[PDB]
Design a protein around this nucleic acid. Sequence first.
DNA 1: CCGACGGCGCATCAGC
DNA 2: GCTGATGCGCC
DNA 3: GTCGG
Length: 326
Amino acid sequence: TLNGGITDMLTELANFEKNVSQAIHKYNAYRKAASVIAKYPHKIKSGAEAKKLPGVGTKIAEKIDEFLATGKLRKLEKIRQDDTSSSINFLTRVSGIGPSAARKFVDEGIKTLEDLRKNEDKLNHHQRIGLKYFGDFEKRIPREEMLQMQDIVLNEVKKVDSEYIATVCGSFRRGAESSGDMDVLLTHPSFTSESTKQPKLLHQVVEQLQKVHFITDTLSKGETKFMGVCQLPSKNDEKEYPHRRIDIRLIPKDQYYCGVLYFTGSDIFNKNMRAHALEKGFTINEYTIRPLGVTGVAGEPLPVDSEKDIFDYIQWKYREPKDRSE
DNA sequence: CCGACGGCGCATCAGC
DNA sequence: GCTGATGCGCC
DNA sequence: GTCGG
Ligand SMILES: [Ca+2]
Ligand SMILES: [Ca+2]
C-alpha cells in the first residue's frame, strides 16, 4: 500500500458524504478515486500526478496536495471535531442503521453505543441484532476460519439435497487472507429462470444450518436472499468464536455465471464492469447480460456458459477473481 | 455546460 | 391486504 | 465529485 494515507483520506470523505451529507454520488466518486489510487503502482508525489487518473478530478487533486504537504486534511480534522457528524458516522456502523436512522437517533439524543443498549425497544429487528453483535461484526475472519465455515456450509446443504451447489463468493473467492463476512451462492436444479419446481429451497437450507447451530440469528429473509448471523463451533474449554455475518443468495441454476460474477465482486469492480458494459451496449445484473436497443431498452438475455463469456461480450480480457479486488 | 453515475432483494410505511 | 417510495443492505 | 460529449 504505497498510498494508504491518501486512500484512507478519501475513504473517510466517502463515508462522511454518505452517512452525514447523504450525498450518494459524492460517496461513489470518492470511492472510485480511492480505488483507482489504491491500484496505482507508484508512490504518489503530487495531486497533478493523481489527476491523471480517471475518477480523480480537480477537487481531489487539491486535497491530495494538502495531504502530501501536511499529513492531514483540515476538512476532515473539522469533521472529526464535530459532535453531530461524529455521532452519526458512528451509529451507521451498526447493521440496519443507515444515514437516515442515525440522524433520527441523534435527534432524539441517542448517540452512543451505551444509549443504543438501553434503547433496544426503539430498534427494528435488523438493528437489534446488529447492535447485539456490534463488536463481533467489526472483527475480520481469518481465511482458516473461512475454510472451516465453507466446509460446514457445503456439507450441510449436501445433507439436505445432494443436488444443491453452494459456492463461497465475495472476498474469499478472490483469495483474500481475511474476509469481512461470508457470501454463499446457492443453486438447485428445481429453480431456473423457466420454473420453480420445488418450494422453500432457500428456507430448507437456512433451517438445516439453524439445526446444527451454525446459523444463530436472522437479519432478513425472503425466497432468494438470506441475511443473517452464524458461528463456528468451538472445542472443549476454549473461548467461543465471534459471531459472523452470512449472506446466502439463491440464484436460478441456469444463471449461475452471472450470479457468481456478481457475488464475487468486488463491489467497485462490479460497478466498473457494469459501467463498461453499458458503453459496449449491454446491461449486466446478477441474472443476465442483455443487449441495449436503439432506445436503451434491455433486449433478451444473451447465451452465457462461463464467466469469461460475460467478459467476452463487453470485450474485456478475462480477469481471475483474485484480480477483481478493486 | 450538464446528464449520468450498476443493479437489485427485503423491510417498512404512507396512501388507498 | 396491495402498490410504490424509501431505507438499508449485498457484491 | 468526475467525466464524456
Ligand atoms: Ca463479503
Ligand atoms: Ca456479505
